[PDB]
């Protein structure tokens, strides 16, 4: 994995030595070369994971998140340059450097062999994200949004740090390759109970948990577009990836301690969906949709069945691409109407027809239209939760009504009906914007043809 | 007037001075070459050749092989009267149960 970290580090002299108009083109070209290079991690085996060194390995779980992460840099560089055309050249290079630095921390968060290196990179991804949110955000409430994002996560993770050192003193190592083989059944006491809480609550914060999700609708509507893309598509999936790593060590106490957080998520996926019904703020609607989808990932990791893990990883990849496309659609309104109020700009199908078709495709994949891998992930999670308890289908099926009702209302409000009279700066869609929608959605539509590369360590 | 300040600029249309603009850059040669970089290294490199690369993966996690092995091993136990699957995975002669 040192053939991916060295070019990502080489992207810093690629962006600090470039000419004043070349700093987007060079980084986009070389980052697309890195993303096409990133398909070499499909050398996975049905028994052995692809294991590189003492410091890095990459199973079939970290591999699609890696391809998504190294693919998400050129899409952020495309999405985040029209609102930064008047910005100074030095801070423009700084914004590109922070995106490259965040990619550098993410690609060796997922390939972490030993879990305290996973922790160091897992909390290292805060710093460029925090600088992006508080510096290149657009409105007044970003500075408050720099605190709620930060001091929630650390408030779970500095206990989690302690927990990992305890395993370094008890099992003898924090390698995931060792702890597949030296894992011991964790009995019932209050000591092992707080061991479970210390292992799980930081990832519950970064999933987010229903109740601990207060950072998320404020950290998405106050970030810039590249920030909202990378918080929706990857940084919520650090929690799911970390839970899939860390629930190996937590048997069988998870089989009776995870019940309240399962209840929190199975009811939060109803309540945040009903919140998505009543959002005047479009980017807030997409953020609460991200909560309402990641609640099923929390449930599928805690019930720990193979259908649930494959459905959870498919829903993480598919929701990453879907929510990134939705935030770019919110940006493609907000760069023309200059307000995130969803009830302001109606009737955009009379003005932007192909962009309205992209709104249609993202609004259909958000409600998991088959055979997209949104529906594969959603479907396998619902199947495994019917296997878990036979009443839970109600809370799934009711959710799969309301998941339609904000996916179509955002489709109906922003596109259908009478257009707005006092607005006459609705420009045509740029080639940047439609290329952005195509690079978001067409990999998600091609993964319907071959989903067996994004289905976890136990396909 | 508190905190003396520039007038707020205009939300500029790139299509006024450049109706052939793609939206990447106001200088048209750099703009159209950025379009060429995006479309070539985004579609003529990553989607098409990458989808060809993912299309012909060499048996991703042995989904072909484990079928074909099964199409031998069922043959190994349809012929000679062996059951198709035991209820035991490991050999019960080499397991030491705890006595009671």
């Amino acid at each position: 994995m040192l053939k991916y970290i060295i070019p990502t580090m080489m992207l810093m002299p690629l962006t600090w030595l470039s000419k004043n108009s070349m700093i987007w083109i060079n980084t986009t070209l070389h980052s697309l070369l890195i993303s096409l290079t990133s398909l070499l991690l499909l050398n996975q085996f049905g028994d052995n994971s692809l294991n590189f060194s003492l410091t890095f390995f990459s199973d079939s779980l970290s591999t699609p998140l890696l391809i998504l992460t190294m693919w998400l840099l050129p899409l952020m560089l495309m999405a985040s340059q029209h609102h930064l055309s008047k910005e100074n050249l030095a801070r423009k290079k700084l914004f590109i450097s922070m995106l490259i630095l965040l990619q550098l921390f993410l690609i060796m968060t997922f390939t972490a062999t030993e879990l305290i290196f996973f922790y160091i990179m897992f909390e290292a991804t805060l710093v460029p994200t925090l600088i992006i949110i508080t510096r290149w955000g657009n409105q007044t409430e970003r500075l408050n949004a720099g605190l709620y994002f930060l001091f929630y996560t650390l408030a779970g993770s500095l206990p989690l740090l302690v927990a990992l050192i305890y395993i370094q003193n008890t099992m003898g190592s924090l390698n995931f390759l060792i702890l597949q083989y030296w894992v011991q059944p964790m009995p019932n006491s209050w000591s092992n109970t707080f061991m479970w809480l210390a292992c799980m609550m930081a990832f519950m914060v970064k999933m987010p948990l229903y109740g601990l999700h207060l950072w998320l609708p404020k950290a998405h509507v106050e970030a810039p577009i590249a920030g909202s893309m990378v918080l929706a598509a990857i940084l919520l999936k650090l929690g799911g990836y970390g839970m899939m790593r860390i629930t190996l060590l937590l048997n069988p106490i998870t089989d009776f301690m995870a019940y309240p957080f399962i209840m929190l998520s199975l009811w939060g996926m109803i309540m945040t969906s009903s919140i998505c019904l009543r959002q005047t703020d479009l980017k807030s609607l997409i953020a609460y949709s991200s909560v309402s989808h990641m609640a099923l990932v929390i449930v599928a990791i805690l019930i720990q069945t193979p259908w649930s893990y494959m459905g959870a990883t498919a829903l993480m990849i598919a929701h990453g691409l879907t929510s990134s496309m939705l935030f770019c659609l919110a940006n493609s309104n907000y760069e023309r109407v200059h307000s995130r109020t969803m009830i302001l700009a109606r009737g955009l199908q009379t003005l932007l027809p192909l962009m309205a078709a992209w709104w249609l495709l993202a609004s259909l994949t958000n409600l998991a239209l088959p055979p997209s891998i949104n529906l594969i992930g959603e479907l396998f999670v619902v199947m495994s939760t019917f296997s878990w308890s036979n009443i839970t289908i109600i809370l799934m099926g009711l959710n799969m009504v309301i998941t339609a009702l904000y996916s179509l209302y955002m489709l109906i409000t922003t596109q259908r009906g009478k257009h707005t009279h006092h607005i006459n700066n609705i420009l045509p869609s740029f080639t940047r914007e439609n290329a952005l929608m195509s690079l978001h959605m067409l990999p998600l539509l091609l993964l319907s043809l071959n989903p067996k590369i994004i289905l976890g360590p136990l396909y | 007037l508190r905190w003396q300040e520039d007038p707020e600029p205009e939300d500029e249309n790139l299509y006024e001075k450049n109706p052939d603009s793609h939206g990447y850059d106001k200088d048209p040669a750099v703009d159209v070459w950025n379009m060429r970089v995006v479309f070539f290294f985004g579609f003529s490199i990553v989607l098409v050749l990458g989808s060809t690369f993912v299309a012909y993966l060499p048996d991703y996690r042995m989904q072909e092989w484990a079928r074909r092995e099964a199409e031998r091993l069922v043959k190994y136990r349809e012929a000679h009267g062996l059951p198709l699957m035991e209820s035991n995975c490991f050999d019960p002669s080499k397991i030491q149960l705890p006595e009671d």
Binding site: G137, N138, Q139, T140, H338 | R2, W3, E8, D11
Partner: peptide, 19 residues
Amino acid sequence: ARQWQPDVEWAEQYGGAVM
């Protein structure tokens, strides 16, 4: 419509003897 940066009213919170 542009980016918000702090004004005098926001900056007078950081100017007293205490916070």
